[PDB]
RNA sequence: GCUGCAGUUAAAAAGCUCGUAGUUGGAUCUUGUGGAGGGUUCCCCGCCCCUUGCCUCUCGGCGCCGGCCCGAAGCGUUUACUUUGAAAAAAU
RNA sequence: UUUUCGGAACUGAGGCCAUGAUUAAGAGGGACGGCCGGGGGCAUUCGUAUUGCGCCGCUAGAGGUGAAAUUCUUGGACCGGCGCAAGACGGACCAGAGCGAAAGCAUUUGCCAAGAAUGUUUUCAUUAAUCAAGAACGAAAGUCGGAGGUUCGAAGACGAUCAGAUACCGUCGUAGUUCCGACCAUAAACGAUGCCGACUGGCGAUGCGGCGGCGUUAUUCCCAUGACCCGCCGGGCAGCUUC
């Protein structure tokens, strides 16, 4: 059965994008994507999207600029802290030029650059580059 | 389908030919009509997919036949859906 | 997919996104409540008396007319029975194929199909004494079963 | 074996059965036939078994699987002896099955909603039968045999209807029962000059004079006592389709069974051309069938102007066939309806009730 | 082989199905304008509807010409998580 | 000594709160409707054929092999005809077709209980997925106790072949092969490929249920419905093609 629904938003926007398609929908919707979805459109990683009411949970429809190389989730949501963040961006992003790490913590879901700023641990939910 | 078709404004002929649990947004295919008959004038209402032999307020004995798929009148006098 | 089955077919029901009430609808929520009370008279299930408000009345949802599932406004009144509709059905069913197999005991698809209703009545019913529908002590039994549905 | 696994479960397990695809037809009647057999045992067999008895004429009609089709006559016999078996158990008391409680004899039947309105079944059982004889003489040639000997069931519906006045418990004569006598005068309506003065001309002192005889003698005087009783309660019809349609039929008693001022006195009382107009064809079937008579009656009277007054309006045009209802699909280059004459067809008046075109051409 | 292996043919998926413990489990229930540090909207004060969510005492200092105010306390449904204090022999 | 007034608790009438139930899963269960299939159990019924027996016809061979021989036959074999008996089996139609958890499942008709998919503006409302312990079913061969015994045939007795032939080829034949009641738990038990869920190209067919449509054909005179033809949607056993 369906065990987790963040998952599955990552590998149909991941299969889409190496077809080269322009958009892509995802189905069912959730509080969680729409959090990851903003802040991948922040960074400038993916076009605009739009949410669809339907009475059961919603769609989603999202837009592609082709500039995407991976995203992905991590299956347990691990705890990490400001010590052992280095050893989880060295072993997941390609470059220390570019690329992110997506944290959940108690000032919200953000950036793994910006949990340093804010000065907070938290647990892994994806990635992207 | 294209590399580029978009998916926010299919056209209603897109969205008439799949399953109705496959469409944007859901909607059935069934619906509701007024039926009259011979003898006795009283008109009354009929679901199209119904699974009762419906009797009429006319007392008549059969106002339609239950069928695997939509139910099939009596020669009646309206087979007219309702608007809304 | 289905539980005991390798089938995986699809069909359903498929509500409307309008919830409200049509302009043509003749009748009123208090008029609704006395129909499915005198329905409930000659022993009829919820499951039942759906059905005979959708094909002969234009009550399509009777939620969105009255604001309560059918169940709720028979237990208001002390009309709904104390087994549940489902747990009721499936009983009488094991009932059924126990007769069977009193004179035919080589039919050996029968006594594999009785494994099958048993563990789904047993499933069923550890659900319903969690939550207070059935007593603690309340227990299907193979002897027994012929007087639960007398 | 026993008595109430027969007049309930032995019923309603084959009584459910009316409509669905898996079922008989046939043995649909003749189990109902075998409930009313069996019936031969006491506190049963004088009583309730009525119910069957309802059910089972019932059941005679849907042998036809639609309801455009007529009875065959094979199975059309059954029907006039079966509905005078239910009538003649209606004279041997005065207490009720099938309706209101009054004795509590080993059934309780009085559970239906609003239960007396069971009662009005006979009436609606015997109207579904007064217009299924009309659907027999639409459908055999009129020039011949046939015809002639079809016309010998005219009396025996007339014999039928008239009893529902003896016999009857409604609320008296005067809730809505009193359709029985529209259904009585609809067979009277029509009936022709020589007739109307079979007890006027031909000999008047010469016949049988009791009570016995009487009720019979009254004859075109229940055509006067039909017309004026009841339009009290016929007002309780919202329905102008309805409601309007009576007038019409009631003036061509008086156009033949007395004098042509009384046909025209209630005709331009009642001034209802632009209200049928605004009604359907088979309400205007009487306008414009009732006008030609008050033409025609100035014609027989002598009175020349006014016969032309009244027949020139139908003269107009050669509509007079698609006002019997029988026009051809062509017989010109303008026709071109097809959905709707099939409509009309089911809507006409029987050949024996047509007045003579060429009688009405020469007058 | 947790990070990190393999099971059509090289070694390897129980003949097949049910099922208690164990592991895993769908969607949903409060936001944008104003000021500081910094930018050209967001992190601290105070607000559309609640900002410690309530509350009114009494043993106990404050502000002022008794009464009304502002720091404790009852405490915020219970835990994991995370960040911070305290307290842990020396040698290595 | 008694009230007051505070603390604890059983209990009655009464007006206040928008007085209190999140949705309905392209999750699961249950009801309902018309169908569908070599799916299972019990009874019933038909067809030739193979072997045996009775009676009639005619004359010298018949069987079997690469070639032979064992075997059968003038109180008559093999061949032709008519009729009777017993036990086993369901050809052709029969297909990359259907049904079942797998092992497996094909003459007629009736009776008993069960089931997938589809249709649904029915109902309950998270009841679910996968599984130590434990449990049901499980080809053929084999073992124990009854009944039957047509055909075929491990062991065995013989004829050939050959250096030998305890084999391949031929004639005969015990156990078994069939039914009833208990055991046994294995297989190249195979798609040599666990189950549940999501996503990613194209095309023509095929079995089941539903939806739409111009004609042809059948029954009654239309209508409805069956056989055919052109499309669409579920879910099924498969095929061709592609950087």
Redesign the pocket.
């Given at each position: 059965?369906?065990?987790?629904?963040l998952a599955?938003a990552l590998?149909?926007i991941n299969?889409?994008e190496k077809?080269g398609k322009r958009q892509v929908l995802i189905?069912?919707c959730?509080?969680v994507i729409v959090r990851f979805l903003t802040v991948m459109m922040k960074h400038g990683y993916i076009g605009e999207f739009e949410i669809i009411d339907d009475?059961?949970?919603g769609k989603i429809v999202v837009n592609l600029t082709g500039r995407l190389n991976k995203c992905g989730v991590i299956s347990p949501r691990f705890?990490?802290?400001?010590?052992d963040l280095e050893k989880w961006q060295n072993?997941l992003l390609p470059s220390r030029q570019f690329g992110f790490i997506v944290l959940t913590t108690?000032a919200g879901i953000m950036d793994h650059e910006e949990a340093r700023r804010?000065?907070?641990?938290?647990?892994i939910l994806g990635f992207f580059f | 389908?294209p590399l580029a078709k978009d998916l926010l404004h299919p056209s209603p002929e897109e969205e008439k030919?799949?399953?109705?649990?496959?469409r944007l947004v859901?909607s059935?295919?069934?619906?509701?009509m007024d039926v009259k008959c011979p003898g006795c004038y009283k008109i009354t209402t009929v679901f199209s997919?119904a699974?009762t032999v419906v009797l009429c307020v006319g007392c008549s004995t059969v106002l339609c036949q239950?069928?695997?798929?939509?139910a099939?009148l009596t020669?009646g006098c309206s087979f007219r859906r309702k608007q809304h | 997919?289905?539980?005991?089955?390798?089938?995986?077919?699809?069909?359903?029901?498929?509500?409307?996104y309008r919830?409200s009430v049509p302009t043509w609808l003749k009748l009123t929520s208090d008029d609704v409540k006395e129909q499915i009370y005198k329905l409930a008279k000659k022993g009829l299930?919820?499951?039942?008396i759906?059905?005979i408000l959708?094909d002969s009345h234009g009550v399509?949802?009777?939620?969105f007319v009255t604001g309560?599932?059918?169940?709720?406004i028979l237990k208001?009144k002390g009309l709904a029975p104390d087994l549940?509709?489902?747990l009721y059905?499936?009983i009488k069913?094991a009932v059924?194929?126990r007769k069977?197999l009193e004179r035919?005991r080589?039919?050996?698809?029968?006594?594999?199909?009785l494994?099958?209703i048993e563990?789904?009545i047993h499933?069923?019913a550890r659900?319903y004494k969690t939550?207070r529908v059935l007593p603690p002590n309340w227990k299907y039994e193979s002897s027994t079963a012929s007087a639960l549905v007398a | 074996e026993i008595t109430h696994a027969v007049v309930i479960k032995k019923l309603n397990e084959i009584l459910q059965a009316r409509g669905?695809?898996?079922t008989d037809r046939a043995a649909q009647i003749e189990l109902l036939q075998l409930l009313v057999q069996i019936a031969s045992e006491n506190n049963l067999g004088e009583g309730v078994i009525v119910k069957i008895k309802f059910n089972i004429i019932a059941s005679l009609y849907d042998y036809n699987p639609?309801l455009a089709?007529y009875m065959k006559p094979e199975m059309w016999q059954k029907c006039l002896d079966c509905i005078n078996e239910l009538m003649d158990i209606l004279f041997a008391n005065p207490n009720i099955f099938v309706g209101e409680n009054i004795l509590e004899e080993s059934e309780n039947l009085q559970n239906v909603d609003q239960p007396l309105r069971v009662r009005g079944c006979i009436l609606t059982l015997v109207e579904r039968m007064d217009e299924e004889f009309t659907k027999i003489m639409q459908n055999t040639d009129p020039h011949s045999q046939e015809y002639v000997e079809h016309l010998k069931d005219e009396a025996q519906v007339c014999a039928i209807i008239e009893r529902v006045q003896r016999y009857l418990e409604e609320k008296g004569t005067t809730e809505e029962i009193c359709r029985v006598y529209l259904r009585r005068i609809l067979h009277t309506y029509y009936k022709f000059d020589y007739k109307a003065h079979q007890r006027q001309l031909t000999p008047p002192e010469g016949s049988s004079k009791s009570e016995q005889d009487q009720a019979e003698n009254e004859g075109e005087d229940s055509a006067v006592l039909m017309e004026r009783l009841c339009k009290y309660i016929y007002a309780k019809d919202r329905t102008d389709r309805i409601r309007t349609c009576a007038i019409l039929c009631h003036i061509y008693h008086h156009a033949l069974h007395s004098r042509w001022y009384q046909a025209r006195d209630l005709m331009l009382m009642s001034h209802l051309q632009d209200n049928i107009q605004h009604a359907d064809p088979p309400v205007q079937i009487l306008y414009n069938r009732t006008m030609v008579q008050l033409g025609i009656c100035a014609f027989r009277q002598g009175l020349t102007k006014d016969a032309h007054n009244a027949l020139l309006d139908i003269q107009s045009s050669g509509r007079a066939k698609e006002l019997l209802g029988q026009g051809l699909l062509l017989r010109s280059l303008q026709e071109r309806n097809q959905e709707q004459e099939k409509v009309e067809r089911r809507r006409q008046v029987p050949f024996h009730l047509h007045i003579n075109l060429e009688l009405l051409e020469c007058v």
């Open positions: 059965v369906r065990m987790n629904v599955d590998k149909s299969n889409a077809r189905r069912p959730s509080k009475h059961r949970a705890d990490v802290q400001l010590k072993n108690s804010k000065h907070t641990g938290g647990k | 389908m030919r799949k399953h109705k649990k496959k859901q059935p295919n069934s619906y509701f997919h699974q239950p069928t695997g798929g939509k099939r020669e | 997919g289905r539980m005991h089955a390798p089938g995986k077919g699809l069909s359903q029901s498929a509500l409307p919830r299930t919820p499951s039942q759906g059905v959708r399509a949802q009777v939620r309560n599932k059918i169940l709720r208001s549940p509709e489902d059905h499936l069913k059924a194929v069977h035919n080589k039919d050996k698809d029968a006594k594999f199909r494994i099958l563990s789904r499933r069923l659900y939550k | 669905k695809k898996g639609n089709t």
